[PDB]
Write an enzyme that holds these catalytic residues in place. Structure first.
Site, short mmCIF file in Angstrom:
data_model
loop_
_atom_site.label_atom_id
_atom_site.label_comp_id
_atom_site.label_asym_id
_atom_site.label_seq_id
_atom_site.Cartn_x
_atom_site.Cartn_y
_atom_site.Cartn_z
N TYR A 1 -57.81 -42.38 8.97
CA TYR A 1 -58.95 -43.33 9.27
C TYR A 1 -59.24 -44.60 8.42
CZ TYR A 1 -59.47 -41.49 13.93
OH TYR A 1 -59.22 -41.13 15.24
N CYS B 1 -94.15 -21.57 13.04
CA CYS B 1 -93.65 -22.81 12.51
C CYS B 1 -93.88 -23.94 13.49
CB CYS B 1 -92.19 -22.68 12.11
SG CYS B 1 -91.07 -22.70 13.47
#
Ligand SMILES: *[C@@H]1O[C@H](CO)[C@@H](O[C@@H]2O[C@H](CO)[C@@H](O)[C@H](O)[C@H]2NC(C)=O)[C@H](O)[C@H]1NC(C)=O
Ligand code: NAG
Ligand code: NAG
Ligand code: CA
Ligand code: CU
Ligand code: CU
Lengths: 631, 630
Positions: free
Chosen positions: B19, B609
């Site tokens: 890359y 939560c």
């Protein structure tokens, strides 16, 4: 000092989500919102004021001090029943019950009213800020009823921080910001998919790459295209930001304000450039935006910015280039005198960013123009100009010339550096084309005209102005501080007996006593008061006031002024024609911003009372400094 | 002073064989001539630029790329004739040209630090800030345009000409080559990692041993992609708010410091399941130096690791195919209130590992509550009484050595390694020192835990969890010790992934009726055992008893439930965490945090939560409150 029981008559309704700016196939949406009403008779919609229209697509501010009382008398008007809920919702005691149904459920048209002491539980601290920030929302389905549209702000303040004037403002100016990524697999959206967008041309995309809010919605309220309205602020009056992120579990948002920095408190106060808002973390942060001009807020998170966070805010107030005040200006300042008409009128409302349908200037007129009285000779560096959005029509002004007057009488055109004959300015291109024009050489004016040179559907405009003052010595010359001695002022005559001596040496902008101001022996218009500067001075204007005589009121209604260099013969003050009939007092107290068109260069200043109230009575002050000394 | 930085931006080819990107150059140009500071820690990095409170910096970027690329700051002020950010800030002709440097262009940059953007009276000597590039925010970044930009009080050029400081810039960053500048066929684009040092790659340098090392740490990405970073030694600067493990999100920068022990190049995690495989790493060679040319307690714990059975939802049960809850446990026939065979830590009375220690039916699965103030020593004597062998290690203390000697079990590199078979017992010593405990800022009791470490979660997930509490000094003296210090109480937010548990298909011959179709590895069955719970209890299974006017600390953590974070609930209740008052606690997967609470809101409260996509997959309990007596 007292405690207050502050109710808020509030409800939940719908309409929803507009786009129309510049950037027509636009979709209707029909989500739910909170809305503040006027009383128990849930009638007056309580028009959202210019000062809090940023709030926009969420609910109104609910506000309290420490040892306070909060009350909500609530009505639901909708399908799915909803509710009020936040953290300090301090319910009470117990009951003959079946395992404690503490369930808050508010059925449509029913009224569920709740109210509770707001303990130091909810309060900010000595370490903290002048106010903390908290959320309220519908807890019927905290999951859906948040994408649905029942976000709400709640402010909890130190004692002695609010006002009679509602809310606070002791160098304040607050704004809330509500960063979610709305989605409609939530709240009744069925009544949208086949309500609008579909008839006999339907059956296209069920739930495959359709994502209608991950097609759009990246809220900073729900005016969150890449532009929401009311971010007006004075480039000093230091602004407190209320950042509360919500939504789901990807709803981290990391926001900042370009070319600005803010301070956050906690343990202490430490300085920061951007803040990873979390879902459930209700931030308060303050900053002093001492860079004038026009900026924006953006969630720096790559993919979030690129589908709706680049959402402008403007600073006007000085160094030097601040917005001259079109958010922060003058409620309905100045407009035209025939040039300009279309029901939804001229200025009155032709400012930058002004949200709504009834918004901006509007005239199908080949010969047009608008006019702003800056109420003082000012430096104008530029003008941010923008357009409006109609039925499905893109309409704006494409070209314009700029004339100005420093005076009102004789005008003329403009010729930005070395152009040609006439300075042709390029307009907008759409319904959100903020084309910040700058004046190449600057302009000093009091009045600006804008004249269209081509339009879209109508000569159509909304605009801000760039610049700031020249900076004359608008500072008290020495009447107050008494830098000018009691010896240094005489008058035409002074009233005097035994229980009083209203000597000239008393005429002082705020002065208490038994004889606490100047008074003439009797009442004549050819009567006067004389300051002597022991040197040569420059003057902005004289601040006038009357006396509180415990007897009755006393003040001067109209007056004249005279100047001298010799101090024994007098060249008096003039307009553009005859003498200046000065707009004076109307009370025992209250002073008068009464200043002069040609700044008067003198050393002997005389006040000439013309019309008055009960007797001629003067407490006063001069504004200014000095040029050269005498010659 | 008045500082200049004459450095443009370039296209470069990158590596550690995959890359190649566009970077941010470094060079002394008037044209295009070499100039490099980069050797070590500098990865893909425009030079760390440093300006002091009162100064004025002048970057002039020479652009060389197929890209239209900008330059834009943060944490600093400037004129609308910089900013470097395109969009209609009204801006006259010349005021917009900063906003986008047309491809292969050239532009000067006007940068100011005023008093109003220098660093606050008391915080980081020197502020963490980066310098971005935004024309197409997503593109300009993932491609590879980012540098460090530092700003601080009156004295670098003068008090670092005379001062010694060990500082680096670590760029915790996640470039995604599918969102690059760039665009049968089988192998589409990828990366995910620190400083630009991939997979397992290592960068460069180290700092001296007997003192401190500061790092300006810049969070990165193009998506909401949270991390959680570690190494050995505590990482105590956040403010001098004093932290377990640097926790990084979308775009984040504050700046932090640590001490050292010796040469041990210390291990550098991203420490999350998902980010792991393709994760972040680097070393730290802590070497010798150039610049020379009412007392303390003694705690005791006999704990065994021991196999038992676990009913996650006993009290309450009401399943069929009637729900998403109805689906949970053993996706063949058996599916009621859910029973599995687990192995949880459990402590005994004495060396004769016989007398059952009376349990805490609120802590469910959780191990015995471990506690030790700064200065104390934990003699933790540990038996295995489960076949498949494990051990014990506290995430918290650093001085953990076998009781009597400073040996290493005949062979291994350090105790969280391999030791303890079925049957055998080991005497461990945990000594706690000021460095791993709180401070004059924190709470007085930071939250931590012990797992076992023979396998990571292929251990933990099967039950190896218990709460470790490290605390400030005190005994009938110090602060708050005159009538009573009201008891200690722990909540543990945990997804147990039975799918990995060391009792895997053991459990399928058990509770699941017939393996006469021995099916495994599945869409819904794998999901059928991901057990989102608080202390093993789930779906409003055993809640907690408390009462009003009662007042004490909660200690809470996220463990096993990883890949994500947890904003955490409490209905109508509010807490004093970090001596502010917030109503929701954001919690990572390291996540040790310590709240405080005035219990005076009478009623049912649905603790769960703030995320409403687990609190339906279970993940909720209840709490009750009503007057008491004494
Ligand atoms: C370092 O990166 C390489 C990139 O290929 C990883 O190699 C493979 O990753 C795939 C993921 O689809 C796995 O199935 C394999 O385990 C790997 N196969 C090969 C050929 O080695 C590799 O996993 C990474 N290294 C680390 C830190 O484990
Ligand atoms: C009262 O409010 C709700 C709004 O949906 C509805 O059930 C009902 O029609 C309303 N009542 C009226 C206007 O008669
Ligand atoms: C116009 O003239 C002024 C005079 O100094 C100059 O500052 C400005 O750059 C000129 N306008 C242009 C060409 O943008
Ligand atoms: Ca610009
Ligand atoms: Cu975001
Ligand atoms: Cu990671």
């Amino acid at each position: 000092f007292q405690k207050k029981t502050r109710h808020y008559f509030i409800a939940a309704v719908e309409r929803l989500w507009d786009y129309g700016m510049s950037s027509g196939s636009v979709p209707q949406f029909k989500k739910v919102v909170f809305q503040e009403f006027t009383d128990g008779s849930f009638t007056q919609p309580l028009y959202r004021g210019e000062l809090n229209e940023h709030l926009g697509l969420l609910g109104p501010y609910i506000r309290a001090e420490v040892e306070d009382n909060i009350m909500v008398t609530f009505r639901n008007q909708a399908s799915r029943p909803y509710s009020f809920y936040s953290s300090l919702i301090s319910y009470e005691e117990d009951q003959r019950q079946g395992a404690e149904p503490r369930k808050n459920f508010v059925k449509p048209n029913e009224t569920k009213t709740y109210f509770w002491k707001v303990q130091h539980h909810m309060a900010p601290t000595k370490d903290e800020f002048d106010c903390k920030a908290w959320a309220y929302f519908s807890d019927v389905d905290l999951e859906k009823d948040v994408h649905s549209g029942l976000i709400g702000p709640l402010l909890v303040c130190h004692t002695n921080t609010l006002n009679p004037a509602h809310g606070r403002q002791v160098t304040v100016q607050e704004f809330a910001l509500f960063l979610t990524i709305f989605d409609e697999t939530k709240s009744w959206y069925f009544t949208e998919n086949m309500e609008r967008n579909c008839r006999a041309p339907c059956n296209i995309q069920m739930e495959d790459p359709t994502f209608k809010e991950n097609y759009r919605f990246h809220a900073i309220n729900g005016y969150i295209m890449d532009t929401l309205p009311g971010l007006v602020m004075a480039q000093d009056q230091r602004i407190r930001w209320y950042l509360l992120s919500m939504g789901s579990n990807e709803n981290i948002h990391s926001i900042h304000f370009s070319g600005h920095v803010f301070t956050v408190r906690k343990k202490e106060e430490y300085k920061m450039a951007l803040y990873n808002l979390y879902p459930g973390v209700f931030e308060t942060v303050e900053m002093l935006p001492s860079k004038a001009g026009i900026w924006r807020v953006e969630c720096l998170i790559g993919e979030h910015l690129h589908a709706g966070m680049s959402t402008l805010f403007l600073v006007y107030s000085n160094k030097c280039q601040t917005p001259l005040g079109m958010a922060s200006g003058h409620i309905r300042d100045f407009q035209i005198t025939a040039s300009g008409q279309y029901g939804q009128w001229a200025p009155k409302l032709a400012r930058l960013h002004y949200s709504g349908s009834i918004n901006a200037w509007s005239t199908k007129e080949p010969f047009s123009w608008i006019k702003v009285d800056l109420l003082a000779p000012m430096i104008i560096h530029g003008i941010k100009t923008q357009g409006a959005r109609q039925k499905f029509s893109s309409l704006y002004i494409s070209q314009f010339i700029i004339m100005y007057s420093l005076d009102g009488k004789k005008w003329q055109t403009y010729r930005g550096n070395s152009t040609g004959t006439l300075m042709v300015f390029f307009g907008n291109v759409d319904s959100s084309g903020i084309k910040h024009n700058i004046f190449n050489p600057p302009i000093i004016a009091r009045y600006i005209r804008l004249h269209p040179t081509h339009y879209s559907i109508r000569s159509t405009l909304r605009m801000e102005l760039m610049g700031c003052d020249l900076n004359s010595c608008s500072m008290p010359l020495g009447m107050e501080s008494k830098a000018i001695s009691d010896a240094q002022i005489t008058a035409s005559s002074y009233f005097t007996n035994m229980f009083a001596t209203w000597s000239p040496s008393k005429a002082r902008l705020h002065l208490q006593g038994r004889s606490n101001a100047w008074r003439p022996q009797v009442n004549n218009p050819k009567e006067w008061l004389q300051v002597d500067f022991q040197k040569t001075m420059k003057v902005t204007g004289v601040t006038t006031q009357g006396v509180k005589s415990l007897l009755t009121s006393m003040y001067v209604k109209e007056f004249l002024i005279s100047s001298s260099q010799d101090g024994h013969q007098w060249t008096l003050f003039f307009q553009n024609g005859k003498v200046k009939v000065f707009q004076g007092n109307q009370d025992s107290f209250t002073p008068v911003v009464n200043s002069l068109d040609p700044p008067l260069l003198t050393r002997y200043l005389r006040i000439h009372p013309q019309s008055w109230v009960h007797q001629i009575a003067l407490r006063m002050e001069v504004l200014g400094c000095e040029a050269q000394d005498l010659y | 002073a008045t500082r200049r930085y004459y450095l443009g931006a370039v296209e470069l080819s990158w590596d550690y064989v995959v890359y190649k990107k566009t970077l941010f150059v470094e060079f002394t140009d008037h044209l295009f001539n070499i100039a490099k500071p980069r050797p070590p820690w500098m990865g893909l990095l425009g030079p760390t630029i440093q300006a002091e409170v009162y100064d004025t910096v002048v970057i002039t970027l020479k652009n060389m790329a197929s890209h239209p690329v900008s330059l834009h700051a943060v944490g600093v002020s400037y004129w609308k004739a910089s900013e470097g950010a395109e969009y209609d800030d009204q801006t006259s002709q010349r005021e917009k040209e900063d906003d986008k440097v047309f491809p292969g262009g050239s532009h000067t940059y006007v940068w100011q630090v005023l008093k109003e953007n220098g660093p606050m009276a008391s915080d980081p000597l020197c502020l963490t800030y980066s310098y971005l590039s935004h024309v197409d925010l997503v593109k300009d970044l993932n491609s590879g345009l980012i540098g460090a930009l530092l700003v601080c009080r009156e004295g670098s050029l003068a008090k670092e000409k005379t001062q010694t400081l060990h500082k680096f810039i670590l760029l915790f960053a996640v470039f995604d080559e599918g969102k690059s500048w760039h665009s049968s066929a089988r192998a589409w684009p990828k990366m995910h990692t620190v400083n630009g040092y991939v997979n397992r790659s290592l960068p460069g340098l180290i700092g001296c041993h007997r003192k401190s090392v500061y790092w300006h740490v810049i969070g990165m990405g193009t998506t909401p992609e949270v991390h959680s970073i570690f190494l050995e030694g505590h990482t105590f600067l956040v403010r001098n708010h004093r932290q377990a493990s640097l926790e990084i999100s979308p775009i984040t920068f504050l700046t932090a410091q640590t001490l050292l022990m010796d040469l041990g190049q210390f291990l550098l995690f991203c420490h999350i399941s998902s980010h792991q495989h393709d994760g972040m790493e680097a070393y730290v060679k802590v070497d010798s130096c150039p610049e020379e040319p009412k007392h303390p307690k003694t705690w005791v714990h006999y704990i065994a690791a021991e196999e038992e059975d676990w009913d996650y939802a006993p009290l309450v049960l009401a399943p069929d195919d009637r729900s998403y809850k109805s689906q949970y446990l053993n996706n063949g026939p058996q599916r009621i209130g859910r029973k599995y065979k687990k192995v949880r830590f459990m402590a005994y009375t004495d060396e004769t590992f016989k007398t059952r220690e009376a349990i805490q039916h609120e802590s469910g699965i959780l191990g015995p509550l471990l506690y030790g103030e700064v200065g104390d020593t934990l003699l933790i004597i540990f038996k295995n009484q489960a076949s498949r062998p494990y051990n014990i290690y506290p995430h918290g203390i650093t001085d953990v050595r076998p009781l009597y000697s400073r040996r290493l079990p005949k062979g291994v590199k350090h105790l969280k390694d391999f030791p303890i078979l079925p049957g055998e017992i080991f005497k461990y010593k945990w000594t706690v020192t000021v460095e791993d405990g709180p401070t004059k800022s924190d709470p007085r009791c930071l939250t931590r835990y012990y797992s076992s470490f023979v396998n990571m979660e292929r251990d933990l997930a099967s039950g190896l969890i218990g709460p470790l509490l490290i605390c400030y000094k005190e005994s009938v003296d110090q602060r708050g010790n005159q009538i009573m210090s009201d008891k200690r109480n722990v909540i543990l937010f945990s997804v147990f992934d039975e799918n990995r548990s060391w009792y895997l298909t053991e459990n399928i011959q058990r509770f699941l009726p017939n393996p006469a179709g021995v099916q495994l590895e599945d869409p819904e069955f794998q999901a059928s055992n991901i057990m989102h719970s608080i202390n093993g209890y789930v779906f409003d299974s055993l809640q907690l008893s408390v009462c009003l006017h009662e007042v004490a600390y909660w200690y809470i953590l996220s463990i096993g439930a990883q890949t994500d974070f947890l904003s955490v609930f409490f209905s109508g209740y509010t807490f004093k965490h970090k001596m502010v008052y917030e109503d929701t606690l954001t919690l990572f997967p390291f996540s040790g945090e310590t709240v405080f609470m005035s219990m005076e809101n009478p009623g049912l409260w649905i603790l769960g939560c703030h995320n409403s996509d687990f609190r339906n997959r279970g993940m909720t309990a209840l709490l009750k409150v009503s007057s008491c007596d004494k």
